[PDB]
Design a protein around this ligand. Structure first.
Ligand SMILES: O=C1C[C@]2(C=N1)CCCNC2
Lengths: 237, 300
């Protein structure tokens, strides 16, 4: 059934599982036409498919050409997401295939279930967690590969960098969701926090800066402050 | 006009014959039902006065044999039986009629309701659904489960309708996942009509039989069957025009006959709102939509 605060540690056990987030699959800019009507222009998107235990991110880039000539794109985007996840699973060796796939939005359940009928033993689950994966496109290296793509492409990342050398996957996921929640609440401020010290750099093979353990504690505190801040600025408290 | 005699009526019971019903008191001198129209299947059904639990009854066609009812004090129910001695049977019936111990099937001449509810229902098909090949009639009760319910437990006592499952490999062609899930025409026309039933008459017969078992016995699995077969048609963008017009007539008479006070348990709000207001066929069921909106506007 649904994944929530009560069965949270299940994410870090040794049953392979993947989160799938479809928020950034179908992306548009809205604009005025010469006649003064409104129209949309699609831009490249991505499926965010994440193993929360290992940090492996399967970033399937969705090139705007897949929408050409198609109707009802918001609906199509859910089925295209399901199609690509099913294709990913089929491409993996049996012993790497997930036992569960957790979708971040309930509208993905039926599309994914139907595309995965061949895999009756893979559980398709919703979640009551409000996960901030829509903010993945605030990570500069991910936004860059998506916007530069000229054709469909899958790119593999570890969204935890080398953190698992020092911390557990529960703690790494907690850091990830704090970073993404901050970037979603105030991207400018969050990015300022992460880069304000030019002596701390991002390795070429990494997504986030090379913080020491002590620096991560400070960064994490600054992200909480930001989130609580914006929560006041928003509600006036 | 045929007759189903009763040996006796030892226990107080409400007896149904098709859409009619009457009360029989304990040891009342009741000896059966006469003037039953030839040409239709029929159902004779029972609810004991001391245990309204388990409605039960028998589907039969008097053209297929001479049938009678006899109470079994060991198994505690009224049983249908076949009399093979045709002379014995004619003799029994004639005596009971002469003594006027039979109720008359009370059909009004203007009234096509039973025909309209059983138009496509065939005894030969009912006997494939309800498997008990040694009898020519078929027993159904409130508790019998369907093959689909059993997949999700005695097989000899199950209702073998075709299982309708919209999220199944049979329903979904590889490579047409979105297309086949949002427009079920493939599953309706190729899998069910051409493949399983053979024609729409057979499909409507199972649809009608499922409704009647839901209505007369409160059989939950039959109600699920009825709604699934409706939803499969309404969710198909490509349906022959004659099927849609006939479906509208079928459903009209089912909605018309349903007890007003059972609408809450026999009608699925989601399916009916979807079929009448969202589906491909939302504009194709004029008679059904009009009677539903005037009889059960709450459900919608
Ligand atoms: O299992 C089954 C299916 C069927 C009889 N037994 C075949 C005729 C169509 N539905 C009923």
């Amino acid at each position: 059934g649904a994944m929530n605060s009560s069965n949270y540690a299940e994410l870090f056990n040794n049953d392979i599982k993947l989160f799938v987030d479809d928020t950034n699959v179908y992306r548009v800019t809205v604009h005025k036409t010469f006649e003064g009507n409104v129209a949309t222009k699609a831009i490249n998107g991505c499926i965010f498919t994440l193993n929360p235990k290992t940090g492996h991110l399967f970033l399937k880039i969705i090139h705007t050409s897949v929408w050409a000539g198609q109707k009802r794109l918001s609906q199509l985007a859910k089925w295209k997401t399901a199609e690509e996840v099913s294709a990913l699973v089929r491409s993996l060796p049996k012993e790497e295939q997930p036992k569960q796939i957790i979708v971040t939005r309930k509208a993905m359940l039926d599309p994914l279930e139907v595309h995965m009928l061949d895999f009756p033993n893979i559980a398709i689950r919703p979640t009551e967690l409000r996960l901030p994966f829509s903010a993945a496109m605030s990570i500069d290296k991910l936004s860059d590969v998506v916007m530069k793509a000229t054709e469909p492409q899958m790119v593999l990342f570890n969204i935890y960098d080398d953190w698992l050398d020092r911390i557990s996957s529960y703690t790494a996921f907690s850091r990830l969701t704090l970073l993404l929640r901050a970037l979603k609440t105030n991207e400018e401020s969050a990015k300022m926090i992460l880069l304000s010290d030019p002596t701390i750099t991002i390795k070429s093979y990494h997504l986030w800066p090379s913080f020491t353990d002590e620096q991560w504690i400070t960064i994490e505190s600054q992200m909480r402050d930001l989130i609580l801040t914006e929560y006041g600025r928003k509600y006036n408290v | 006009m045929n007759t189903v005699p009763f040996t006796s009526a030892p226990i107080e019971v409400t007896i149904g014959i098709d859409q009619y019903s009457f009360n029989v008191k304990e040891n009342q001198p009741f000896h059966g039902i006469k003037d039953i129209p030839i040409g239709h299947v029929h159902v004779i059904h029972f609810q004991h006065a001391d245990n309204s639990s388990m409605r039960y009854g028998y589907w039969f066609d008097c053209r297929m044999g001479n049938f009678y009812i006899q109470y079994d004090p060991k198994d505690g129910l009224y049983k249908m039986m076949e009399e093979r001695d045709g002379a014995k049977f004619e003799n029994i019936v004639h005596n009971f009629k002469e003594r006027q111990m039979m109720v008359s099937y009370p059909k009004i001449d203007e009234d096509d309701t039973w025909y309209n509810l059983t138009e496509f229902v065939q005894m030969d098909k009912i006997r494939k659904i309800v498997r008990k090949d040694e009898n020519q009639f078929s027993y159904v009760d409130s508790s019998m489960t369907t093959v689909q319910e059993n997949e999700l437990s005695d097989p000899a006592h199950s209702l073998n309708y075709t299982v309708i499952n919209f999220k199944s490999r049979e329903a979904i062609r590889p490579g047409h996942e979105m297309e086949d899930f949002l427009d079920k025409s493939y599953y309706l026309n190729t899998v069910m009509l051409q493949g399983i039933f053979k024609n729409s008459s057979n499909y409507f017969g199972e649809l009608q039989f499922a409704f009647l078992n839901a209505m007369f016995f409160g059989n939950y699995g039959s109600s699920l069957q009825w709604h699934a077969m409706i939803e499969l048609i309404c969710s198909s963008a490509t349906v022959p025009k004659h099927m849609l017009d006939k479906l509208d007539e079928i459903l009209y008479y089912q909605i018309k006959t349903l007890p007003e006070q059972y609408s809450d348990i026999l009608l699925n709000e989601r399916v009916w709102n979807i079929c009448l207001y969202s589906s491909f066929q939302k504009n194709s069921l004029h008679n059904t939509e009009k009677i539903m909106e005037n009889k059960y506007p709450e459900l919608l």
